[PDB]
Amino acid sequence: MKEFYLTVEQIGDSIFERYIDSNGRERTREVEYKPSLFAHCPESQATKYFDIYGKPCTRKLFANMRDASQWIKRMEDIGLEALGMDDFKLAYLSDTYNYEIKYDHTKIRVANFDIEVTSPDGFPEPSQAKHPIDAITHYDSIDDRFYVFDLLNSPYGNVEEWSIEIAAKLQEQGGDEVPSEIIDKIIYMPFDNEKELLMEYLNFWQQKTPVILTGWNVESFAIPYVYNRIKNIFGESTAKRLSPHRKTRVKVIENMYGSREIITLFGISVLDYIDLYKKFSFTNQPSYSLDYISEFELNVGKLKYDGPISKLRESNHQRYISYNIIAVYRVLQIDAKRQFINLSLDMGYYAKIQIQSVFSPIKTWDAIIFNSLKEQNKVIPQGRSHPVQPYPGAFVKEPIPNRYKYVMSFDLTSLYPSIIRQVNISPETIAGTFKVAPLHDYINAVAERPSDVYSCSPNGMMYYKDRDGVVPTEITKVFNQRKEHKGYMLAAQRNGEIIKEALHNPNLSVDEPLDVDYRFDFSDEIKEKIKKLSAKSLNEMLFRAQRTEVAGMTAQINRKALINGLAGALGNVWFRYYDLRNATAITTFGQMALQWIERKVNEYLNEVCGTEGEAFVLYGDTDSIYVSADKIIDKVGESKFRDTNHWVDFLDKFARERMEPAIDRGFREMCEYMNNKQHLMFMDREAIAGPPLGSKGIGGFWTGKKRYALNVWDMEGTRYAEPKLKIMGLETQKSSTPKAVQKALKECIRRMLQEGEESLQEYFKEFEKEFRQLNYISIASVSSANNIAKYDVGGFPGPKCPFHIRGILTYNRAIKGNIDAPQVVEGEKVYVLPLREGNPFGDKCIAWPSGTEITDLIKDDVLHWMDYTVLLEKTFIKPLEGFTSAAKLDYEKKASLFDMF
DNA sequence: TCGGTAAGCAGTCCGCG
DNA sequence: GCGGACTGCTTAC
Ligand SMILES: Nc1ncnc2c1ncn2[C@H]1C[C@H](O)[C@@H](COP(=O)(O)OP(=O)(O)OP(=O)(O)O)O1
Ligand SMILES: [Ca+2]
Ligand SMILES: [Ca+2]
Ligand SMILES: [Ca+2]
Ligand SMILES: [Ca+2]
């Protein structure tokens, strides 16, 4: 097999590499890598190295890495560019793996771990590590085993061994319900003392050294806790055994408001799953506790126990250990679903970076572009300092707030990357500038043609047309991968709908789910067999179709994020290829494209409807247009349609056969106007929206920019079994809105779009009447909580104190003295509730850590003083009033002359 | 929250005769 | 009470 790296580090003048050799074996080597860097040299000199602009360079081979670094410094002291890859480990990988990496995940050791630490005096600070570590569960992907290290004797209690038989039993038998599929995979090791536990853990770690290290909050808690605890008990040298090269560094993580510390373990790649989730999941959660995220992703119940966690070990060690094991498994189950580890491996090896560098689009692209240029003996420029400067982004059209009955949307494919490719935007393809006209003049095709030679953007930039830039070349490669996966995702989604249809008529029989590849549209033979399946088989297939869809979503959306990251990196001062001329060339071209095609589509439709000056495009944002289709439907007449699906087909056919060719012609002209290298503005139909045939539903409404709802029947070729609400921006979509409130507002919108005014008034009246019964958590608002210190003045709100921060200060006064009450953590999220006048807490609101029950100390008083009226008005009525006035509806029946009968 | 811009709404503070 | 200037937070792209 072809070799591949596992990890790479620079330690002084040595590269330390762990890798898989040509026999599939894990090895480690130390290499005294001699880096090369580059300087410009005289034009008449025989060299094979040229910078990206074609200026000749001489290569400088250094005796070692420190010499190379020193040289860079002196080149700065002189005032001359020092060219080449200054991150020597990327040059090492480029040299050592000079081919497209083929990796085998089964050889990569992926460790998932979690620790427990009992603490009476509140949160066990990792940087202190003053309390014993009393449980570790470490799952190893190569052995497929959960290794459980259990402390039986502690200063906080001596306990009995954990029982695997009780762990397996149902909770109803007094057991812990550890999933039966992992019971045989547990290797249980009890210890008489913490020192033995930790020494055996290190020995284990040496034998089975993680390559990828993950878990939940491992980087901010488990890793520093374990390192510091071992450090405290044994000394530094023993703690450094967590690094396969015996090298570790305390690293300060700084943000705007302060900083924290993590431990860098050289020769390990830490991918903390909470961070993977935040980067790749495209959710925003009210809470990031493992129990909250598990429930969300997997529909598994919360891990239930009595008393505080600080007393769990002593009161119920059986459950304590079982929950530690289950916690480790829940991360594996989320990863089985989301496949973020697989994603990180793919992107990391593709770029030839340290796997953990997938968190940085700048590092990822720097390495892709460097490898690409290196293939042609080209030399990358030195990174420079730039002051941070604001620059302009997308155009968003101001919509007229209203109901909109029939709507078809269209959207440009991978816009920013497509612009890069079409225009040929790249550091080395800049050809010059032209004199810019107001954007309006380009939009209306009245400005002078920018160039007869070069490819242009309306920001004034011109680019070479003779060859592709490295940026267009490399972005195309990832775009093509993205396109493949989106295909599988969309096929899995269509297949899901076929299964949902068949579930209307499940067969009374005993059978099996079909063995199919959900990434591909079901054949006719498969569809026939489906129509004959039981509900149990069909549901199982649906679960599988939906997993396939999620896997595709992960693969496609994060490749989209990567290429969109390159367009954005051009406007980040830390990027080697930072250039506001290129960042703005992209965004400005996008503005033109949208408004250009708005004009074209209006012109096309005014023509086919025999009108003039009417606005058919009602809205647009960045790269999308929403077209009012009422008139198209009206030209046939509602009367002519058999059912909803009939007009959906008609609109689909109109968009494909009439609108899309018109849109294509408009963009080809624009390409010619701008003299671009390649026409890549492909704007396809996205949504077909409208009320159910014969209903009084309104179909859709806009309240403003980035705020709208539509009742969608077909999305990007997926024909839904049941219509789906596409709601953007509104409160149902915001993590800050209470859960029960999101749900009620969503049902109000459903009724508006699908059923009409009367149905809405029916539901509103009932919600208002019943809401005071709702569980307090479900009606709490949510907010991130920054600068609690800034606004704290002796425990009371300072000037300009934000509402949620006030709540925290209320909470802090109410729990003061209690070392054991849960603390609000700076920068994390809180639940927030308003409080009625004259309450014991002495203020108008209270907040506590999100994803938790508020401590028993005060729960009773909070429940009693909760201001339901304020809660209702703020989170429910006010947004509903916004929706309904926009839609010209009333959520309450207005009096009429009939109310005399 | 270590890892592109546009723009919405909540809330504070204060004006607005 | 509503709006503007401002901060804070959260979305849509
Ligand atoms: N998360 C993001 N980060 C950076 N730029 C973004 C992001 N989302 C959107 N943009 C910018 C770049 C996009 O090309 C453009 C239009 O967005 P959008 O329609 O969501 O995706 P897209 O057009 O790139 O892909 P798709 O093919 O799925 O439509 O807005
Ligand atoms: Ca725990
Ligand atoms: Ca798009
Ligand atoms: Ca059937
Ligand atoms: Ca879009």
- The residues spanned by each domain of chain A are 1-108+340-382, 109-339, 383-468+573-729, 469-572, 730-774+867-889, 775-866
- Residue A203 · residue A347 · CB < 8 Å: no
- Residue A224 · residue A262 · CB < 8 Å: yes
How far CA A875 is from CA of A658, A846, A858, A880, in Å, comes to 44, 16, 24, 9
The DSSP line for A471-509 is HHHHHHHHHHHHHHHHHHHHHHHHHHHHHHHHTTS--SS
Give the C-alpha separation, A687 to A701, whole Å.
14
Which bin fits A348, alpha (ψ -120 to 50), beta or left (φ > 0)? alpha
- And the tokens for A22? 């040509």
Give the C-alpha separation, A267 to A358, whole Å.
16
Radius of gyration of chain A from Cα atoms?
31
The residue whose CA has the least distance to atom 9 of ligand 1 is A564
CA of A360 to C1' of B3 (A): 5
Nearest alpha-carbon partner for A686 in A704, A663, A670: A663
Amino acid at A500: K
* DSSP bridge partners of A408: A627, A688
Give the C-alpha separation, A594 to A591, whole Å.
6
- And the tokens for A1? 């097999």
CA of A580 to C1' of B4 (A): 11
Give the C-alpha separation, A293 to A299, whole Å.
9
Give the C-alpha separation, A59 to A45, whole Å.
12
Give the C-alpha separation, A136 to A325, whole Å.
9
Method: X-ray
Task: Assign domain A775-866 one CATH number from 3.20.20.140, 3.40.1820.10, 3.30.200.210, 3.30.465.10.
Answer: 3.40.1820.10
Residue nearest B10 (alpha carbon to C1'): A803
Give the C-alpha separation, A55 to A46, whole Å.
12
- And the tokens for A234? 């044994």
Nearest alpha-carbon partner for A844 in A852, A835, A853: A835
Query: C-alpha A136: how far from its chain's center?
Result: 29
Strands A269-270 and A212-214: parallel
Q: Which residues surround ligand 3, an ion (CB under 5 A)?
A: A 411-412, 415, 623
Give the C-alpha separation, A831 to A848, whole Å.
6
- Residue A805 · residue A791 · CB < 8 Å: yes
Give the C-alpha separation, A128 to A113, whole Å.
20
Of the residues A623, A624, A680, A685, which should be mutated to test ligand 1's pocket, given the most ligand atoms within 8 Å of the CB? Answer: A623
Give the C-alpha separation, A266 to A240, whole Å.
9
Cα four-point dihedral sign A879, A883, A886, A889? negative
Give the C-alpha separation, A760 to A763, whole Å.
5
Give the C-alpha separation, A213 to A194, whole Å.
23
Nearest alpha-carbon partner for A226 in A263, A261, A260: A263
For tokens 């020995």, the residue is A203
Nearest alpha-carbon partner for A287 in A786, A876, A783: A783
Q: Say which CATH architecture domain A730-774+867-889 belongs to.
A: Up-down Bundle (1.20)
Give the C-alpha separation, A555 to A347, whole Å.
10
* Edge-first strand listing for the sheet containing A4-11: A4-11, A14-20, A26-31
**Nucleic acid strand B within 7 Å of A879 CB:** yes
Give the C-alpha separation, A257 to A573, whole Å.
21
Nearest nt to A256, CA vs C1'?
B1
Nearest alpha-carbon partner for A774 in A852, A724, A833, A814: A833
Strands A624-628 and A26-31: unpaired
The residue whose CA has the least distance to atom 6 of ligand 1 is A564
Ligand 1 pocket list (CB less than 6 A): A 411-416, 560-561, 564, 568, 622-623
The DSSP line for A309-346 is HHHHHHH-HHHHHHHHHHHHHHHHHHHHHH-HHHHHHH
Give the C-alpha separation, A445 to A673, whole Å.
8
Strands A269-270 and A407-412: unpaired
Nearest alpha-carbon partner for A234 in A271, A203, A269, A191: A203
Amino acid at A68: A
- And the tokens for A340? 């973020």
Give the C-alpha separation, A542 to A496, whole Å.
6
Cα four-point dihedral sign A218, A220, A225, A230? positive
User: Which residues fall within 8 angstroms of residue A860, CB to CB, at 6 or more apart?
Assistant: none
CB < 7 Å to strand B — which of 211-250 in chain A?
Answer: 219
Of the residues A278, A410, A416, which should be mutated to test ligand 1's pocket, given the most ligand atoms within 8 Å of the CB? Answer: A416
Which bin fits A523, alpha (ψ -120 to 50), beta or left (φ > 0)? beta
For tokens 């993205």, the residue is A482
- Residue A463 · residue A431 · CB < 8 Å: yes
Amino acid at A540: E
CB < 7 Å to strand B — which of 576-605 in chain A?
Answer: 587
H or E element at residue A845: strand A845-849
Do A1-108+340-382 and A469-572 have matching folds? no
CB < 7 Å to strand B — which of 351-370 in chain A?
Answer: 356, 359-362
**Nucleic acid strand B within 7 Å of A568 CB:** yes
Which ligand 1 atom is the nearest neighbour of the CA of A568? 4
**Nucleic acid strand C within 7 Å of A394 CB:** yes
Start-to-end Cα distance in chain A: 87
Burial classification of residue A228, based on how many CB atoms lie within 10 Å of its CB (0-12 exposed, 13-18 middle, 19 or more buried): buried
* DSSP bridge partners of A40: A57
Task: Assign domain A109-339 one CATH number from 3.30.830.10, 3.60.110.10, 3.30.420.10, 3.40.50.150.
Answer: 3.30.420.10
Q: Where are the extended beta strands (E) located within A162-214?
A: 186-191, 212-214
* DSSP bridge partners of A255: A258
Give the C-alpha separation, A745 to A112, whole Å.
40
Residue A82: helix, strand or coil by DSSP? coil
Nearest alpha-carbon partner for A221 in A116, A360, A148: A116
CB < 7 Å to strand B — which of 776-805 in chain A?
Answer: 784, 786, 799-803
Burial classification of residue A29, based on how many CB atoms lie within 10 Å of its CB (0-12 exposed, 13-18 middle, 19 or more buried): exposed
- Residue A735 · residue A832 · CB < 8 Å: no
User: Which residues fall within 8 angstroms of residue A526, CB to CB, at 6 or more apart?
Assistant: A514, A516
The upper half-sphere exposure of residue A199, i.e. CA atoms within 13 Å in the direction of its Cβ, equals: 9
**Nucleic acid strand B within 7 Å of A690 CB:** no
Please give the distance, rounded to the nearest whole angstrom, from the Cα atom of residue A411 to the centre of ligand 5: 5
Please state the CATH superfamily assignment of the domain spanning residues A383-468+573-729 in this structure: B family DNA polymerase, palm domain (3.90.1600.10)
- Residue A68 · residue A35 · CB < 8 Å: yes
* DSSP bridge partners of A36: A61
Nearest alpha-carbon partner for A867 in A810, A821, A813: A810
For tokens 């639940």, the residue is A831
Helices of type H across A375-469: 415-423, 439-443
- Residue A514 · residue A531 · CB < 8 Å: no
Nearest alpha-carbon partner for A404 in A628, A711, A601, A723: A628
Cα four-point dihedral sign A36, A42, A45, A47? positive
**Nucleic acid strand B within 7 Å of A719 CB:** no
The upper half-sphere exposure of residue A502, i.e. CA atoms within 13 Å in the direction of its Cβ, equals: 24
Q: Say which CATH architecture domain A1-108+340-382 belongs to.
A: 2-Layer Sandwich (3.30)
Residue A563 backbone phi and psi in degrees, to 5: -70, -35
CB < 7 Å to strand B — which of 270-329 in chain A?
Answer: 272, 275, 278-279
Give the C-alpha separation, A579 to A558, whole Å.
24
Protein-contacted bases of chain B (C-beta within 7 A): 1-13
Give the C-alpha separation, A177 to A323, whole Å.
10
Resolution at which this structure was determined, Å: 2.0
Give the C-alpha separation, A492 to A530, whole Å.
15
> Which ligand sits nearest to residue A279's alpha carbon?
1
Residue nearest C13 (alpha carbon to C1'): A622
Give the C-alpha separation, A419 to A590, whole Å.
8
Q: How many helices (H) and strands (E) does chain A have?
A: 29, 33
* DSSP bridge partners of A174: none
Neighbours of A892 (CB within 10 A): 10
The upper half-sphere exposure of residue A580, i.e. CA atoms within 13 Å in the direction of its Cβ, equals: 8
Residue A488 backbone phi and psi in degrees, to 5: -65, -40
The upper half-sphere exposure of residue A877, i.e. CA atoms within 13 Å in the direction of its Cβ, equals: 12
Give the C-alpha separation, A633 to A616, whole Å.
13
Residue A582 backbone phi and psi in degrees, to 5: -80, -40
Residue A597: helix, strand or coil by DSSP? helix
Give the C-alpha separation, A203 to A753, whole Å.
63
Cα four-point dihedral sign A777, A778, A779, A780? positive
CATH code of the domain made up of A469-572 = 1.10.287.690
Nearest alpha-carbon partner for A767 in A784, A750, A783: A750
- Residue A164 · residue A322 · CB < 8 Å: no
**Nucleic acid strand C within 7 Å of A287 CB:** no
For tokens 């269209």, the residue is A410
Which bin fits A757, alpha (ψ -120 to 50), beta or left (φ > 0)? alpha
